[PDB]
Amino acid sequence: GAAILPDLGTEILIPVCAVIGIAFALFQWLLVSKVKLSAVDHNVVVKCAEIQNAISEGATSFLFTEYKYVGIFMVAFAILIFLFLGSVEGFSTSPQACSYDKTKTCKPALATAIFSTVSFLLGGVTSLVSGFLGMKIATYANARTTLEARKGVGKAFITAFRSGAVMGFLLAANGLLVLYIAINLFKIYYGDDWGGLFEAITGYGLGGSSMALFGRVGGGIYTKAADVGADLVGKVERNIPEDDPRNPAVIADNVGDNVGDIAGMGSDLFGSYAESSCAALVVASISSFGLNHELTAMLYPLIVSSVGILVCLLTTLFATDFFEIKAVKEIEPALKKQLVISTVLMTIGVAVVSFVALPTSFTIFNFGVQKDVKSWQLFLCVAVGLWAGLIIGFVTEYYTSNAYSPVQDVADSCRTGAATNVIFGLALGYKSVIIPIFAIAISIFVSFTFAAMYGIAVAALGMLSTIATGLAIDAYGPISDNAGGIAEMAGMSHRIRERTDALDAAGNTTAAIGKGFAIGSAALVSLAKFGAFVSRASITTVDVLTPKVFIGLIVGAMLPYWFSAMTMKSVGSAALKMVEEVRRQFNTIPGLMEGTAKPDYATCVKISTDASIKEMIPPGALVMLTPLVVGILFGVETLSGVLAGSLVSGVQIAISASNTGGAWDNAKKYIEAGASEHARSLGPKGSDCHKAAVIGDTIGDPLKDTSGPSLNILIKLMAVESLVFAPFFATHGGLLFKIF
Amino acid sequence: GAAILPDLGTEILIPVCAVIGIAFALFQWLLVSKVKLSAVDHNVVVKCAEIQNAISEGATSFLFTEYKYVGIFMVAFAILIFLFLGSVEGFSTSPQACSYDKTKTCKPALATAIFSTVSFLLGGVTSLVSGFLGMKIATYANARTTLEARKGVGKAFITAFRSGAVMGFLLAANGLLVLYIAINLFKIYYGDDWGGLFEAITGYGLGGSSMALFGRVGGGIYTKAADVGADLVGKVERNIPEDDPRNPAVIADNVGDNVGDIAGMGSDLFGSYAESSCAALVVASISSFGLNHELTAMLYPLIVSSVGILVCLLTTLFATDFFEIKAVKEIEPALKKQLVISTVLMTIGVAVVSFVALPTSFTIFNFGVQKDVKSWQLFLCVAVGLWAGLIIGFVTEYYTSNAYSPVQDVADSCRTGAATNVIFGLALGYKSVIIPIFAIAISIFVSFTFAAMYGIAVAALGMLSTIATGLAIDAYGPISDNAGGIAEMAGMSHRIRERTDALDAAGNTTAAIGKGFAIGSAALVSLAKFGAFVSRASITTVDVLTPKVFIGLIVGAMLPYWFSAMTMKSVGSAALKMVEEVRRQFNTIPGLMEGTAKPDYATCVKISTDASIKEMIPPGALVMLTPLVVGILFGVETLSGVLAGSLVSGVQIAISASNTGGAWDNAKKYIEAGASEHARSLGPKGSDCHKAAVIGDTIGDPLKDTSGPSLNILIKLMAVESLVFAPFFATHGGLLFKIF
Ligand SMILES: [K+]
Ligand SMILES: [K+]
Ligand SMILES: [Mg+2]
Ligand SMILES: [Mg+2]
Ligand SMILES: [Mg+2]
Ligand SMILES: [Mg+2]
Ligand SMILES: [Mg+2]
Ligand SMILES: [Mg+2]
Ligand SMILES: [Mg+2]
Ligand SMILES: [Mg+2]
Ligand SMILES: [Mg+2]
Ligand SMILES: [Mg+2]
């Protein structure tokens, strides 16, 4: 029945660990505030602050524009949720029997329609705040990482990493806390109807991933229109340094790192956290924990997260205080040791939590039957997910870091042109999918066998128990991107840019690694949500060999490709506008190409703003309308196949897009760095080889930064949407099969 | 119930229609031999036949080397079949209970292990023969297409199309006649055990696709290494023309067209035909047709194929006689009309066949249950697949022909370089999969609903009911591509090359449509085989939400990407060697660029021959070993997942690769033609736009001619293989689930 750790204990521990998380985050922002600068060498400090202000102004300006739209959609959609969910029992206010225990009476479905809408609003608002806070810290840390670079890599590393850790700890504690609050608040109303309490809390992950979808796509098109434009004309055509202040797209480019790579990624990861936690919660609510009203075991996923924070705080110190970087070859293994330490520390942490938060025996809902599960079996569920991440990390690294042969052979293929560079890169990413799929598959088999959907939901959360650390090394990247962006823009020494370029390359690998973690955990959470949807829809069997299910499967597998076609073409078209505008300024503003005259940055901000804001609508629509269109016309059996098909298919293309993109970026950085005979013999910057790498890198730009990373939101989003609307689809769905 | 057509009337009709087709082929070959030439204006006539022979020698050279390896593998594999299938019943020689009716007695399992092996070898040999024959007629008419180009486009077209029709009718009429002989020879032994007759006959399909796998990959690696290397040093670096006899890779390049695009393509479609016929047969054999021993209706697939030949013969006469081409703008429509005509006649053809060769009611095996099916519903099954092919073709043409916006917009994007070209192309291909997947899915729903697995199989055959026309227009492409390369190597007038390039661009679109049909029917056949596998393996339900099935599903979905990574990196590495070699000759043989000295052609053929033969092995291994590894270690449930996932996932990347690839080619052709204001504004040849387009085209080379077209084989092979080994798997597989 009960576990060692009493209910009230859990009620204290959880928000305590959140608060500690926010305290840590603020203490770090404080230490970062020690690096001083203003716009009132002395000049080089002033030039940094004026550039940093351009970016900060530019990124706050876009997010307000984007969130204004997204926020309107969020309201429209909350109405739908209410209407559709309320329409099931014809908006009755009368209680009915608990579908999980006919002897008992539950709160009316109308209530759950209402609280669903509230938890959705919470989830979406929290997702937006995650993006916004992430940008605010990144637009603050960027130039301070520039100034500290004067003292060498190791000092710049610290302000970039301390800052990344600001975002990670803020995001993780805030999401943990909101969920915690929402639960207790709702419980005031639901009392003993824990089934309906947690059914309403599922809106939270729906809100999270909904807003994230637009955040990622909008911020993604914005930033990559800029990037591909600046780089092509600036580097391939006009033969000037990357991020040169003469280049009119340079401000949009660096703003982009903050509205895409940081704000978009911030929200994306919030959704991953929200859904996984919520998937664990719903399965539990109709399992022995929820049925016996055992709060501690019921909140087991929240306790794992609480301990994850503490664990991640301790891990952070190893990079923050117990180790100084002195050479550039030490930067990555620092970042990589962050992963290894937290994984190892969390394993202990999780065994402890498994030991004191669970009863040694209990039951997990398994498609209508209470399965007998043991607490050590549950430990292995979260542990197999946790370690699957680390594996994915190691392998992604091997495939995206220019310290290894795969990428160096990609760089080396530039010797015969761009075409070979592109062929090697594509082949690289395809190859990269293999071990992660295997890690995902193993992870699924173990956790599925032990505790059905709950095991899988808990595996996903295992993969994100170290989410604070994971976020820091991820947010470290774009900060190091801006930092060398400001260095070049402020005409600082070549020795500064050399350091930032080592940081930036390190952030390239961790960018792909975090992408791997998002794909992996999104496959786990999707599979949990899918299987939960099936029960909720009163489906008896998802049988691949029925006509309804199979058409669902093959069409669902096509969706990720449809989505990719849209996002790619969007960037490809906006980048074409950027290139024309950049050329126009170079060819018609006298004095520009010789640094005597100033470029018009605002036009490039205006081109990327107009395209991202407009073009984030159709792919947002495909993802959000699909569950609804399919659920209503074809019904829940066809929807089942669609959920399965987009998972097994989306995952393949997300992984290879992100890795191919990463491999091209770092292949380029390798040539740029000339830190070996081989690398030098490919250089120098401007050579035919370097220009092949730049082409490859720019094709990879929208792959790894718009399509690739958003595809994991597609997969995990369609599953919560389906699970949430399942009562409506079960009852009013499959019209086409009814009219005929 | 029996049909209006008597069994004897069917035993006659089939080989008669075969022989007609074989006659019509022999006729067309002779008519083409009217064009006279030999290696003994007229100065140019002897330079052509000098080149043709260099091509024919080297093509025949490679196929022998390739087939040596393939035949060995074939003999080895035929043993595994005997051994595995033999060990089901412990190698007993006594009869046993029928697998589809315990109340009845069948022929011994060991007898079927033998006939399975005999049919496999039949299929393997008929497959290699299909590739080799196609190579002959191709390497025979290529120079004859060059020479006839001196008298307008419309008269070079004819010899090309006739010669294509030679290969079409030979391959269709022969694969049918070998199957018909095998069925009748086998019937002698099996007597009333029709169930075991057609169970053994399925090895035919396994034979074809097995040997087509290696032909495509090996013949596709060979050809593209050459293609990419030649084009890059030639057109991008040294600014010399495409197919310039100074370029030492032009021979391997033009040999490659016959060795890959012709030989590898003929085996591919044979395997498609064979599997579709067989799948129709194995289901029918345990349905009322085979149970009641009704030979005519039993042989319904072979009857449709027969009428198909006649229809195609009629249809072929339209483009080869009573309709002539004047404008180069008439070529594509002439080919496109071939499809429309044959589809329309064939719809009348199948109506007739359905009317006189079926009973009006019968039963179709439907997972252990005889399902009531009406003749007119079977009519719709083959019809839907027939029309879905036509739909697939038209959509393919829209995204691949430079007569429409998608490809024209892709050419446009060259104005901003190779990077935007590639981004636009990738996005086009992705975009291009939507409608074809909808077509396939609609076929699957309609056919599955009417007649279960039988319908699906009969739909696949419906999509290949006009295989001779389809093969005719498809084989026409590589004949034309060769024809222009001989013109350029003979040094003939540029009046000529603009005619051949018209042919060649038409052939380019055609090749993509061929690719669509192949994938479309592969998807359908794979589903039928998959469904037949499930019954044979005694699986009650393929339930998605079970661990064994899901890991099967996600890992299976990863497979076509693994395969891709191999085939891509292979071409990429061989192309890198090619470029270095061409560079070496140009930089070390004096007078070579000047046209005084002669290049070492034999070295380029040697780089290709080495790469392909060595590198076809692993992708082959992956496809053949997967059913065995999963079937043996994991069991039929998991192998069910792998079959579902690889179909569903593989089809997407198959379609998008072939289309992206075809699009980049035709965009480059658009610019090299200069037949419009827009076109001319991107030229001339040599420009930065033309060069960016060539970058795109050579990246697309391996996507559309190595990976893409082969991926469709991966799907239909793994399915039929699994079906053949089903009894062995069901009995002796699933080991890791038995040890633990
Ligand atoms: K990065
Ligand atoms: K062709
Ligand atoms: Mg860039
Ligand atoms: Mg950037
Ligand atoms: Mg950057
Ligand atoms: Mg970067
Ligand atoms: Mg970039
Ligand atoms: Mg070529
Ligand atoms: Mg060719
Ligand atoms: Mg050619
Ligand atoms: Mg061609
Ligand atoms: Mg080519």
Side-chain angles (χ1 to χ4, degrees):
Chain A
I4 292 168
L5 164 54
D7 281 15
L8 178 80
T10 298
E11 292 281 32
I12 300 177
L13 170 67
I14 287 171
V16 156
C17 289
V19 167
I20 292 175
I22 312 193
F24 196 60
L26 263 11
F27 179 57
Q28 296 289 348
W29 207 334
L30 209 75
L31 295 194
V32 164
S33 71
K34 285 171 184 182
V35 180
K36 300 271 175 175
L37 82 164
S38 180
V40 281
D41 186 12
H42 176 48
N43 302 326
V44 104
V45 176
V46 181
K47 201 48 173 59
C48 286
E50 299 174 309
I51 291 160
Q52 142 157 118
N53 289 326
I55 302 178
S56 159
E57 273 164 324
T60 306
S61 179
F62 172 76
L63 281 206
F64 283 176
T65 313
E66 183 181 67
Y67 291 10
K68 188 216 90 76
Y69 276 96
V70 174
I72 277 166
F73 172 85
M74 175 180 59
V75 173
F77 207 88
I79 297 168
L80 266 236
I81 296 178
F82 171 72
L83 258 32
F84 275 151
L85 253 38
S87 90
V88 177
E89 246 69 16
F91 303 82
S92 163
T93 54
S94 52
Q96 296 306 333
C98 300
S99 54
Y100 52 83
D101 191 345
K102 279 192 51 174
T103 71
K104 282 176 164 56
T105 300
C106 295
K107 298 293 191 298
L110 182 58
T112 306
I114 282 165
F115 280 93
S116 286
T117 306
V118 175
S119 73
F120 171 85
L121 286 168
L122 282 174
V125 156
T126 303
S127 195
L128 292 184
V129 159
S130 292
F132 195 81
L133 272 179
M135 170 270 287
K136 285 301 191 198
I137 174 59
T139 54
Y140 178 97
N142 49 7
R144 292 183 166 71
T145 309
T146 306
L147 296 184
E148 283 268 279
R150 305 176 294 180
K151 327 177 181 190
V153 267
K155 298 286 285 189
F157 180 84
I158 295 300
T159 76
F161 194 69
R162 281 193 186 281
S163 295
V166 176
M167 189 193 177
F169 286 87
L170 274 192
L171 262 50
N174 168 251
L176 172 52
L177 186 61
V178 167
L179 178 51
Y180 171 86
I181 293 166
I183 287 169
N184 294 262
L185 282 172
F186 287 21
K187 190 174 110 98
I188 291 179
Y189 175 67
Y190 282 99
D192 277 344
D193 183 22
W194 290 19
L197 200 165
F198 295 101
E199 180 176 352
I201 293 286
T202 37
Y204 188 60
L206 212 220
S209 293
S210 271
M211 274 65 271
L213 178 61
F214 295 104
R216 264 299 211 194
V217 173
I221 301 160
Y222 185 111
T223 191
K224 258 50 232 173
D227 209 327
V228 187
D231 286 11
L232 284 181
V233 186
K235 306 168 61 174
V236 182
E237 305 187 1
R238 290 329 200 103
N239 301 345
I240 73 185
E242 185 188 280
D243 291 326
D244 191 281
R246 294 175 275 165
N247 198 321
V250 172
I251 284 295
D253 179 294
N254 285 236
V255 166
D257 294 325
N258 295 112
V259 307
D261 300 20
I262 278 271
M265 176 274 298
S267 303
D268 186 351
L269 269 296
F270 169 76
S272 257
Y273 165 83
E275 292 201 42
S276 284
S277 286
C278 286
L281 299 166
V282 272
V283 189
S285 64
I286 59 163
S287 290
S288 59
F289 302 161
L291 297 170
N292 294 323
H293 302 98
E294 305 162 0
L295 190 67
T296 288
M298 184 58 222
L299 300 177
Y300 174 77
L302 297 218
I303 302 180
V304 165
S305 295
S306 282
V307 165
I309 279 175
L310 273 30
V311 164
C312 277
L313 191 159
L314 275 57
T315 301
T316 285
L317 303 185
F318 288 75
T320 271
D321 292 317
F322 310 152
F323 195 107
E324 174 200 30
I325 276 71
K326 303 166 298 81
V328 296
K329 60 159 173 53
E330 297 177 7
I331 303 181
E332 295 201 350
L335 267 5
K336 187 182 187 196
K337 250 40 205 286
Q338 277 295 281
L339 295 196
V340 169
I341 288 180
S342 57
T343 295
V344 167
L345 283 181
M346 197 65 205
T347 305
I348 303 169
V350 156
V352 165
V353 174
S354 290
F355 180 86
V356 324
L358 305 171
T360 60
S361 281
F362 49 86
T363 73
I364 293 304
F365 181 81
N366 176 16
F367 299 109
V369 166
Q370 298 287 342
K371 202 223 226 295
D372 286 292
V373 186
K374 308 292 174 312
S375 63
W376 64 267
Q377 303 178 318
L378 253 197
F379 162 83
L380 300 175
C381 285
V382 7
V384 77
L386 169 65
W387 284 93
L390 184 61
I391 291 173
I392 288 161
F394 272 58
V395 182
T396 295
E397 170 166 291
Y398 169 78
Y399 274 113
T400 54
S401 175
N402 60 37
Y404 306 102
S405 85
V407 165
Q408 284 164 7
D409 293 334
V410 176
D412 188 85
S413 67
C414 296
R415 294 159 37 237
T416 53
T420 44
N421 183 243
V422 169
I423 291 171
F424 277 56
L426 292 179
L428 185 137
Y430 295 165
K431 189 82 168 317
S432 84
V433 315
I434 303 183
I435 296 158
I437 283 322
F438 281 138
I440 290 153
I442 286 161
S443 199
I444 283 162
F445 183 84
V446 169
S447 65
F448 202 158
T449 300
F450 279 148
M453 296 301 101
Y454 186 68
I456 302 179
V458 124
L461 194 79
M463 196 168 305
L464 316 169
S465 54
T466 54
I467 183 50
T469 295
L471 273 192
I473 82 178
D474 195 339
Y476 153 84
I479 298 165
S480 300
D481 205 22
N482 255 210
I486 304 177
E488 187 64 23
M489 269 189 281
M492 295 172 54
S493 15
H494 76 90
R495 215 171 81 185
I496 301 312
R497 181 76 181 199
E498 270 158 42
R499 289 158 190 167
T500 66
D501 279 14
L503 293 193
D504 190 52
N508 280 346
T509 316
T510 72
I513 284 171
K515 231 103 80 168
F517 267 71
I519 304 156
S521 76
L524 267 29
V525 72
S526 269
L527 177 52
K529 298 276 177 191
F530 166 40
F533 155 81
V534 153
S535 294
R536 178 61 68 158
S538 280
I539 301 192
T540 294
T541 329
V542 187
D543 182 355
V544 174
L545 284 168
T546 66
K548 288 185 183 180
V549 168
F550 197 85
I551 71 176
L553 193 75
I554 198 184
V555 166
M558 170 270 290
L559 297 182
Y561 282 88
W562 191 351
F563 183 98
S564 293
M566 285 177 186
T567 51
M568 283 297 276
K569 176 79 163 300
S570 245
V571 172
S573 289
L576 220 170
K577 281 191 172 217
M578 203 64 65
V579 170
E580 287 158 355
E581 189 49 44
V582 171
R583 286 176 186 175
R584 204 221 59 177
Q585 293 199 34
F586 277 144
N587 298 326
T588 75
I589 292 178
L592 186 64
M593 271 298 311
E594 306 90 3
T596 95
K598 252 195 168 305
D600 177 20
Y601 301 144
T603 303
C604 299
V605 166
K606 194 256 212 300
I607 291 172
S608 83
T609 304
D610 281 342
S612 68
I613 282 288
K614 191 218 180 193
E615 301 260 52
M616 63 162 188
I617 304 289
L622 182 66
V623 175
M624 306 263 201
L625 287 190
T626 285
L628 299 168
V629 170
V630 181
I632 289 164
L633 301 177
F634 304 89
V636 300
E637 308 89 348
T638 303
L639 190 57
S640 302
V642 166
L643 296 183
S646 60
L647 171 32
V648 304
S649 186
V651 118
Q652 314 299 341
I653 167 182
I655 293 181
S656 44
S658 297
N659 290 339
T660 300
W664 276 331
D665 196 352
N666 279 342
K668 171 207 65 184
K669 300 293 258 169
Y670 182 72
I671 300 185
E672 302 189 344
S676 80
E677 195 42 47
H678 183 237
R680 278 174 235 128
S681 71
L682 285 183
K685 313 183 168 181
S687 67
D688 281 350
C689 292
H690 176 229
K691 287 180 166 173
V694 172
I695 293 313
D697 171 57
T698 54
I699 303 169
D701 278 318
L703 289 180
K704 72 178 196 302
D705 268 323
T706 324
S707 314
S710 288
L711 224 45
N712 103 90
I713 308 184
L714 182 158
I715 299 170
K716 83 184 154 191
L717 182 52
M718 297 209 306
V720 247
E721 199 178 327
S722 303
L723 169 61
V724 163
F725 281 110
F728 177 78
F729 291 143
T731 305
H732 301 325
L735 295 185
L736 266 41
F737 294 101
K738 284 173 178 173
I739 79 197
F740 306 138
Chain B
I4 305 190
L5 172 55
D7 295 8
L8 201 259
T10 291
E11 292 278 24
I12 298 175
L13 191 134
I14 292 172
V16 161
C17 288
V19 171
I20 287 187
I22 300 192
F24 188 70
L26 264 41
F27 180 58
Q28 294 292 340
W29 202 341
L30 215 53
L31 210 160
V32 156
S33 70
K34 276 190 179 179
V35 176
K36 310 288 187 174
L37 77 153
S38 189
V40 305
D41 193 285
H42 175 75
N43 337 346
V44 106
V45 176
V46 185
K47 185 46 160 47
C48 283
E50 231 177 15
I51 296 161
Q52 182 180 57
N53 288 38
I55 290 174
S56 178
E57 286 150 1
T60 299
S61 194
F62 176 84
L63 284 180
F64 286 169
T65 313
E66 180 179 61
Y67 289 7
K68 193 212 306 186
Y69 281 89
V70 158
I72 287 164
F73 174 86
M74 183 183 60
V75 167
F77 201 80
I79 288 166
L80 276 191
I81 295 173
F82 177 81
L83 270 50
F84 288 159
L85 291 198
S87 81
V88 168
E89 228 57 81
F91 289 101
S92 171
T93 52
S94 44
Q96 70 271 296
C98 288
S99 38
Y100 53 93
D101 198 349
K102 346 163 48 178
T103 71
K104 280 156 175 53
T105 301
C106 282
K107 297 287 203 278
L110 177 56
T112 293
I114 292 163
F115 280 97
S116 288
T117 299
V118 164
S119 65
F120 171 80
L121 300 172
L122 261 170
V125 167
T126 314
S127 212
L128 299 183
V129 160
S130 298
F132 192 94
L133 282 203
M135 173 277 284
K136 292 309 279 289
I137 176 63
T139 69
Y140 180 90
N142 49 350
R144 287 181 173 70
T145 313
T146 303
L147 300 170
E148 284 287 284
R150 299 171 324 196
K151 313 145 201 178
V153 272
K155 302 296 290 177
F157 171 92
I158 292 294
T159 77
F161 186 75
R162 289 190 181 277
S163 317
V166 176
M167 191 210 179
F169 289 97
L170 265 199
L171 268 68
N174 189 73
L176 176 59
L177 191 73
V178 175
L179 182 61
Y180 169 98
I181 293 166
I183 294 172
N184 284 272
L185 287 190
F186 284 29
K187 180 156 79 69
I188 284 176
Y189 173 74
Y190 277 100
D192 285 349
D193 190 12
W194 283 20
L197 196 177
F198 294 102
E199 178 183 4
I201 285 294
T202 78
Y204 197 51
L206 214 214
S209 295
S210 262
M211 276 65 250
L213 186 66
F214 294 94
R216 263 269 174 214
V217 176
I221 290 168
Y222 183 100
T223 186
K224 257 53 231 169
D227 200 345
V228 174
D231 281 11
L232 285 187
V233 202
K235 305 159 63 171
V236 183
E237 294 182 5
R238 303 320 191 86
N239 308 284
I240 77 184
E242 181 182 290
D243 289 322
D244 195 283
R246 277 176 287 163
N247 201 336
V250 184
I251 282 299
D253 179 293
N254 281 245
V255 148
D257 299 323
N258 305 281
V259 135
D261 301 22
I262 285 287
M265 189 268 316
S267 303
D268 201 333
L269 272 303
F270 167 68
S272 274
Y273 161 79
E275 297 204 33
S276 290
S277 279
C278 295
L281 292 185
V282 340
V283 182
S285 64
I286 63 160
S287 290
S288 73
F289 297 162
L291 297 186
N292 302 339
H293 304 96
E294 309 174 352
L295 182 72
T296 290
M298 178 75 225
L299 297 182
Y300 181 76
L302 276 74
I303 295 183
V304 165
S305 287
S306 285
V307 173
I309 296 184
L310 273 36
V311 170
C312 284
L313 182 145
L314 241 77
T315 292
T316 271
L317 295 189
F318 285 71
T320 211
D321 273 78
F322 286 155
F323 232 116
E324 180 221 312
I325 298 89
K326 300 177 278 76
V328 303
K329 82 171 188 71
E330 299 180 348
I331 310 174
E332 284 197 0
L335 267 4
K336 176 179 169 177
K337 227 192 295 183
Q338 286 294 276
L339 300 177
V340 183
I341 292 181
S342 52
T343 295
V344 176
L345 292 185
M346 198 60 201
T347 298
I348 306 178
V350 174
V352 168
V353 171
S354 298
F355 177 83
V356 307
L358 299 170
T360 77
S361 303
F362 42 96
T363 65
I364 288 295
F365 181 79
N366 186 11
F367 296 99
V369 166
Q370 297 300 316
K371 165 184 191 52
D372 292 324
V373 179
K374 297 287 176 288
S375 47
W376 64 267
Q377 299 159 353
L378 257 190
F379 164 76
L380 295 174
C381 290
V382 22
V384 66
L386 169 68
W387 284 99
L390 185 102
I391 308 318
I392 291 168
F394 287 177
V395 180
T396 297
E397 185 198 45
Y398 175 70
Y399 285 107
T400 65
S401 179
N402 61 36
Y404 305 98
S405 84
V407 164
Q408 282 172 4
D409 293 349
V410 171
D412 211 83
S413 72
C414 291
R415 274 161 22 200
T416 57
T420 46
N421 185 223
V422 174
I423 291 173
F424 267 84
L426 289 182
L428 182 151
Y430 293 151
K431 182 68 167 312
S432 82
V433 314
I434 309 167
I435 304 163
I437 289 306
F438 279 142
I440 297 164
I442 293 175
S443 287
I444 294 169
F445 183 85
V446 168
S447 78
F448 211 145
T449 296
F450 287 155
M453 293 303 148
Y454 186 69
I456 297 177
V458 152
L461 193 73
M463 192 171 301
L464 311 178
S465 43
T466 50
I467 191 65
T469 288
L471 265 188
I473 82 189
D474 203 330
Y476 152 82
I479 291 172
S480 300
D481 174 26
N482 238 218
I486 288 170
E488 190 82 34
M489 280 182 292
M492 302 171 57
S493 71
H494 59 77
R495 220 166 57 110
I496 308 296
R497 178 77 180 188
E498 297 181 19
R499 291 175 168 98
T500 73
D501 287 331
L503 296 191
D504 189 41
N508 275 349
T509 325
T510 295
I513 289 162
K515 252 95 107 164
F517 273 88
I519 305 164
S521 54
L524 257 21
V525 93
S526 289
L527 177 50
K529 298 282 183 193
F530 174 43
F533 165 79
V534 169
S535 301
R536 204 67 195 79
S538 301
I539 296 178
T540 307
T541 293
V542 185
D543 182 356
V544 182
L545 288 160
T546 67
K548 285 183 198 187
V549 162
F550 199 86
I551 75 176
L553 189 77
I554 194 183
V555 157
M558 172 271 292
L559 293 183
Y561 283 83
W562 193 346
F563 184 84
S564 280
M566 280 178 192
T567 53
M568 284 288 285
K569 175 64 166 316
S570 273
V571 175
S573 290
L576 190 155
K577 278 176 187 171
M578 201 61 76
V579 165
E580 288 171 342
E581 179 59 10
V582 178
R583 282 183 179 169
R584 202 219 52 170
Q585 295 205 20
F586 275 167
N587 299 311
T588 72
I589 307 179
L592 176 47
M593 280 288 288
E594 287 60 36
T596 94
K598 204 159 274 289
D600 195 15
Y601 289 158
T603 300
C604 284
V605 172
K606 195 252 200 305
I607 288 195
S608 280
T609 306
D610 286 15
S612 62
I613 292 300
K614 180 213 176 180
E615 292 281 58
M616 65 176 178
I617 292 297
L622 182 63
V623 178
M624 308 273 196
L625 295 179
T626 289
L628 291 169
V629 172
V630 179
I632 290 165
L633 299 176
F634 296 85
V636 293
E637 299 89 3
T638 305
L639 181 64
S640 280
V642 163
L643 287 184
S646 88
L647 191 161
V648 123
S649 184
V651 78
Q652 318 287 344
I653 177 176
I655 292 177
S656 65
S658 295
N659 285 335
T660 297
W664 281 329
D665 188 10
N666 270 342
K668 169 209 69 196
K669 299 288 277 185
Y670 183 79
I671 300 186
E672 293 170 342
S676 65
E677 190 79 77
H678 188 216
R680 238 175 281 96
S681 72
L682 294 176
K685 299 166 194 276
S687 39
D688 286 332
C689 281
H690 170 243
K691 277 175 183 211
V694 173
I695 301 312
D697 177 50
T698 58
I699 296 163
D701 277 324
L703 283 170
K704 72 177 198 304
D705 288 329
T706 302
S707 300
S710 295
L711 231 32
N712 97 91
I713 300 176
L714 178 156
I715 318 184
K716 70 174 173 210
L717 186 50
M718 290 214 291
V720 70
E721 181 171 348
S722 298
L723 167 59
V724 161
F725 289 103
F728 176 75
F729 288 145
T731 302
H732 301 301
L735 300 194
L736 312 176
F737 288 115
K738 287 174 175 173
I739 299 169
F740 306 73

